[PDB]
Short mmCIF file of N, CA and C in Angstrom, two decimals:
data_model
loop_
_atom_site.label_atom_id
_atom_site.label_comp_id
_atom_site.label_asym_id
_atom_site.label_seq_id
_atom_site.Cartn_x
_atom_site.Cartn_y
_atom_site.Cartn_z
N UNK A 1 95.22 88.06 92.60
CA UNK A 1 94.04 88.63 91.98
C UNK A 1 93.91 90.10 92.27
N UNK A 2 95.11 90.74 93.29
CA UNK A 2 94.98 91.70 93.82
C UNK A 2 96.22 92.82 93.17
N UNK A 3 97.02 91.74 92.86
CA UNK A 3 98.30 92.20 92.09
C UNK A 3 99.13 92.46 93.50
N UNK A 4 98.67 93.97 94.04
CA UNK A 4 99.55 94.59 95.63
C UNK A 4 98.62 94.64 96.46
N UNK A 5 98.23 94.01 97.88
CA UNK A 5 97.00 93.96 98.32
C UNK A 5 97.33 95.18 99.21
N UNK A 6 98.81 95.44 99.56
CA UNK A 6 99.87 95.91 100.64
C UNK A 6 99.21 95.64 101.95
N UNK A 7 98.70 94.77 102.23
CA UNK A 7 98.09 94.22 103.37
C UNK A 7 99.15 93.93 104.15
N UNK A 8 99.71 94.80 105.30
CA UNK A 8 100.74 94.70 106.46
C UNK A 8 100.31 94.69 107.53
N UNK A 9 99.57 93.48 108.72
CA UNK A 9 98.96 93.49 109.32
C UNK A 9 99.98 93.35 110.60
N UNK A 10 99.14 93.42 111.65
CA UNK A 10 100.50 93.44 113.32
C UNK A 10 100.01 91.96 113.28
N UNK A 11 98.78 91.63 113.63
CA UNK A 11 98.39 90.24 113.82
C UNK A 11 96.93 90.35 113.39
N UNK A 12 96.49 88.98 112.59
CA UNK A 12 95.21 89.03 112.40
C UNK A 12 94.79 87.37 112.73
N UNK A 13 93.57 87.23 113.16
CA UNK A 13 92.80 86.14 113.48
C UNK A 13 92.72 85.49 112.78
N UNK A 14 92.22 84.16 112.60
CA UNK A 14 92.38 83.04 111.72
C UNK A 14 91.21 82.74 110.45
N UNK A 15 90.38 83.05 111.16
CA UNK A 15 89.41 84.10 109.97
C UNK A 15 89.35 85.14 108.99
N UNK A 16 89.37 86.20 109.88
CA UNK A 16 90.46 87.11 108.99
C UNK A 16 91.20 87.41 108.35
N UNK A 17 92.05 86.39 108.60
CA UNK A 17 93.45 86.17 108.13
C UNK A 17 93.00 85.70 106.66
N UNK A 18 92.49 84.70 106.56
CA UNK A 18 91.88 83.89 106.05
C UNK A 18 91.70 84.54 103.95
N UNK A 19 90.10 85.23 104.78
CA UNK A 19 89.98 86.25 104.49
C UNK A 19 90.80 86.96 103.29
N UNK A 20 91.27 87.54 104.63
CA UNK A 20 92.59 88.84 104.19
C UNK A 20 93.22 88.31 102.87
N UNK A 21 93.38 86.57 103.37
CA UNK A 21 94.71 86.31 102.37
C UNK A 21 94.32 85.46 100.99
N UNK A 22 93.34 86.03 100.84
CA UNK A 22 92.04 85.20 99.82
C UNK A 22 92.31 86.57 98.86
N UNK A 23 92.15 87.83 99.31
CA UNK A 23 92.39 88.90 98.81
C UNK A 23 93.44 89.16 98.81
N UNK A 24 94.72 88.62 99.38
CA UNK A 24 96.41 88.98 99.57
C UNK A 24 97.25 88.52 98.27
N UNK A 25 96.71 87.14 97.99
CA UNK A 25 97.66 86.10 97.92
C UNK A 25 97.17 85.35 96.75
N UNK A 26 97.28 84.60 95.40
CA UNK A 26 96.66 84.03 94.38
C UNK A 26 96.14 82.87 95.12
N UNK A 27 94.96 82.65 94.42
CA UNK A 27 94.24 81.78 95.21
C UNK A 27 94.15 80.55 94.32
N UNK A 28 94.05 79.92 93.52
CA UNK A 28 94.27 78.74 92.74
C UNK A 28 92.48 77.94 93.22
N UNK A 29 93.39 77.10 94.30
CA UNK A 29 91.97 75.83 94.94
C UNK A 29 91.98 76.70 96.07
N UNK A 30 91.37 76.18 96.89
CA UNK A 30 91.14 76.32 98.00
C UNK A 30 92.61 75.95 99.03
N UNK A 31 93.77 77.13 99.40
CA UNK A 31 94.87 77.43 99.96
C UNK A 31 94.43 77.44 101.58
N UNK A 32 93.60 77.84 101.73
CA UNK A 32 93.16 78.41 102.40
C UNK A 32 92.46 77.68 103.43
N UNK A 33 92.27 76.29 103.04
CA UNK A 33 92.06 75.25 103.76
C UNK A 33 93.25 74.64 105.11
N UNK A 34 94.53 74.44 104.29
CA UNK A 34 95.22 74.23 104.71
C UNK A 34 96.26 75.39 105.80
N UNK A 35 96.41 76.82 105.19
CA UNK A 35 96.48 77.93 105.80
C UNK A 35 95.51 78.02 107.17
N UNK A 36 94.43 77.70 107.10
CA UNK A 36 93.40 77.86 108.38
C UNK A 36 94.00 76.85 109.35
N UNK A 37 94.06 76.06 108.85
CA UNK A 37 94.27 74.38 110.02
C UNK A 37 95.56 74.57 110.85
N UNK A 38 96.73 75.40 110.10
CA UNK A 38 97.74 75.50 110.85
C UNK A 38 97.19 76.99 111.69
N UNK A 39 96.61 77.52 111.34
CA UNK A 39 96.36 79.11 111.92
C UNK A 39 95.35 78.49 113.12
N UNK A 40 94.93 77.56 113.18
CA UNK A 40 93.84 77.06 114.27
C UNK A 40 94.80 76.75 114.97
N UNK A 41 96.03 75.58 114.46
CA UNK A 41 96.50 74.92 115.81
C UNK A 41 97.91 76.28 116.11
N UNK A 42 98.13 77.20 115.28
CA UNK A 42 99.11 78.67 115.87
C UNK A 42 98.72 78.38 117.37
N UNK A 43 100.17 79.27 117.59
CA UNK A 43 100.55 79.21 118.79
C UNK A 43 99.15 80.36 119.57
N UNK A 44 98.57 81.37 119.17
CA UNK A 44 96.79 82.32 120.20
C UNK A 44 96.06 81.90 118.88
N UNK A 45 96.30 81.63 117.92
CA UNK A 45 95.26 81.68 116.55
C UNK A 45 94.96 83.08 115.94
N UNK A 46 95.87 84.07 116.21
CA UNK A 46 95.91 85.31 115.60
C UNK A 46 97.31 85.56 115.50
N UNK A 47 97.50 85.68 114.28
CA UNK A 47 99.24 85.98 113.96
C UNK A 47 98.82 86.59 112.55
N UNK A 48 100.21 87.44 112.13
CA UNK A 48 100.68 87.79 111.32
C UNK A 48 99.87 87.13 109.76
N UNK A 49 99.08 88.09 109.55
CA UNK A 49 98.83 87.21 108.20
C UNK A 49 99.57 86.45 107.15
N UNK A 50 100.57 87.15 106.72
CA UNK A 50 101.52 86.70 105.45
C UNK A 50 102.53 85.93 106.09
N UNK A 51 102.96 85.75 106.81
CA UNK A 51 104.05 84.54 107.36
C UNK A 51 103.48 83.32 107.80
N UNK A 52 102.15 83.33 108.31
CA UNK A 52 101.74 81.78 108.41
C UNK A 52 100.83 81.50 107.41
N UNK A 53 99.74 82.54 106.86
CA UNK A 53 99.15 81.84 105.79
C UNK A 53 99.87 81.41 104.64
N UNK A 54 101.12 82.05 104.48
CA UNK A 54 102.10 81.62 103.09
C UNK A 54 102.89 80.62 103.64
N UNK A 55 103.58 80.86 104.92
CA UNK A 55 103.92 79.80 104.97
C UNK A 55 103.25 78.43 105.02
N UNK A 56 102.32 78.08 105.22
CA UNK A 56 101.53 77.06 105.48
C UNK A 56 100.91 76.75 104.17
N UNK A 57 100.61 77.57 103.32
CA UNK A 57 100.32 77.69 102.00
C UNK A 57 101.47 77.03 101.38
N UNK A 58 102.57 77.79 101.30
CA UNK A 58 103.66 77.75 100.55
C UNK A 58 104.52 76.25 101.23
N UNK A 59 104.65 75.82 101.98
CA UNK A 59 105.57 74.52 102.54
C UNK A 59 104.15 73.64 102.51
N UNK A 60 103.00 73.59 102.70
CA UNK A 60 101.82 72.14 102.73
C UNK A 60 101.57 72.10 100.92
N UNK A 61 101.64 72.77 100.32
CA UNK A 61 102.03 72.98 98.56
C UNK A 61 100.38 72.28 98.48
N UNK A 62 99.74 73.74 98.80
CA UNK A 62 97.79 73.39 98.82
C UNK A 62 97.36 74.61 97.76
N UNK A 63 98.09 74.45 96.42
CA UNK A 63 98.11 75.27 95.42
C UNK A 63 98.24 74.93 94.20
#
C-alpha cells in the first residue's frame, strides 16, 4: 500500500514492528496476527522487522 516503505530497521519491537509492517508490506487480512505471535515467542521480541514479520507472514501463508 506503500509501494517502497524503504523501512531498514537494526531491530524493532513487536509492536512496532507490527506497525511498521502494516505500512511495509501488503496487507490483505490481518498478516499481522500471525507475524506478532512468532515476534512474541522471538528469541528478546525485538528483531529485525522484514525478516521475521515476512518470514512468519510469508511461511504461516496468513495472506
Amino acid at each position: 500500500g506503500s509501494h517502497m516503505a524503504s523501512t531498514g530497521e537494526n531491530v524493532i519491537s513487536v509492536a512496532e514492528l507490527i506497525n511498521a509492517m502494516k505500512q511495509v508490506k501488503h496487507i490483505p487480512e490481518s498478516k499481522l496476527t500471525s507475524l506478532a505471535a512468532a515476534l512474541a515467542e522471538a528469541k528478546d521480541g525485538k528483531v529485525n522487522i522484514d525478516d521475521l514479520v515476512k518470514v512468519i507472514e510469508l511461511v504461516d501463508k496468513e495472506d
